[model samples]
Target chain A: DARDLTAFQKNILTVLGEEARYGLAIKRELEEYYGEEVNHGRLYPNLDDLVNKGLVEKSELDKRTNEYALTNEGFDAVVDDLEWTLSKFVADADRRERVETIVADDAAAL
Target chain B: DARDLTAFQKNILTVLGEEARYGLAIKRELEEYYGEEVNHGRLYPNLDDLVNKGLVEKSELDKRTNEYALTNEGFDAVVDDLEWTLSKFVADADRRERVETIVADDAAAL
Candidate 1:
């Protein structure tokens, strides 16, 4: 189902995708990706928001580190979302083509 | 990033994954999957939570239909999450293997 997505939610999902990352990892990833320092206060609550809703799952990877994963539904949404991106305003046709190919592969993978 | 996920967030993401869906679609999809009726009140505010945090994007697919999609960061998060899932848990080795392979394929796709 379509709910309005915000920039942060995307970021949260992106951070979670690569590894079983924790909040600090998310904060660090954003800081690194954007090339700037970041804040923890702004980050935690939003991730909590996802937790409240159920798009992502959270577990303790370590005492301080909370590991996250997208639920089956979440996985579905992420894949769907990536595909939508591929189909949308991609500036590079070649990149778009590559993404499209990957989407096809993911579909098969699914 | 790894935030604690509850069951519902997974469901919401699942609902959004297949198409540009609406709140009702989410509600209905949940019902379809779990085999029961659903509620509207619970669905919306949670979505709003996502919007507030910026994980999911909300848009007017139509006057009544709000379309949701993940952000670029979100796309990244989803892929990372899917891969993590492959490594984390799977009762079926074949499914896990396939998911692992798909994670690779999707990673390449990404």
Candidate 2:
């Protein structure tokens, strides 16, 4: 289901997965990753797309600011996407070994 | 960087990562995932974009077929993307545990 979402849309979900944030904050995070200013036109429409999909809930924080938070479905979408990608990589032996080794080391340290 | 590529383009790389496939075969894989016929107009340009970026190696298989395979850089890009995504997801405690658990089980079975 989440496989159909654009990478941009999925990025929005990943950013929101950590915490609820308003539009400007979300835009800032994307801009940091993208290394440029994100266009307002592009940003708002995709935000609206997530809103319409019910993956995100939009709420007004103030008269001028709108906050966005991932719905449970949104979080599930993010998890699903990770699982899907991991599944693909794990199917390839060399790729799977790399991931397994990383996981073991990282998990053991934690 | 791979981050700049669109989701469609990234999907193209994912398919090519598996093996060198001709245009029609690539189109077939994408169509199966999208659940519809892919437009040639959209597909070729993206494949060309990957070629232009040097993420893919394009070769003639015959008079009519052009084979595409992920270059070394392309494979690196895929691994980089997975690592980037995994890092983001792992930063979240709930999400990290989920991934770690699955990774553990999968590695064990392997």
Top candidate (DockQ): 2
Model 1 segments more than 4 A misplaced: A89-110, B1-110
Candidate 1: true interface contacts recovered: 0.00
Clashes of each: 33, 0
RMSD of each: 10.7, 3.2
Error of 1 at B68 (Å): 23
Which 10 successive residues of model 2 chain A have the least lDDT summed? A101-110
What is the DockQ of the complex in model 2?
Answer: 0.41
Q: Residue-wise lDDT of candidate 1 within A1-110, one digit each (tens)? A: 52345556755665665555767777887776545677788788888877777878889867988877777666555555443332222334453454345444554555
In candidate 2 the C-alpha lDDT for residue A56 amounts to 97
Tens digits of per-residue lDDT for model 2 on A25-97? 8999888777788999989999999999989999986566899999999989988767656654564567667
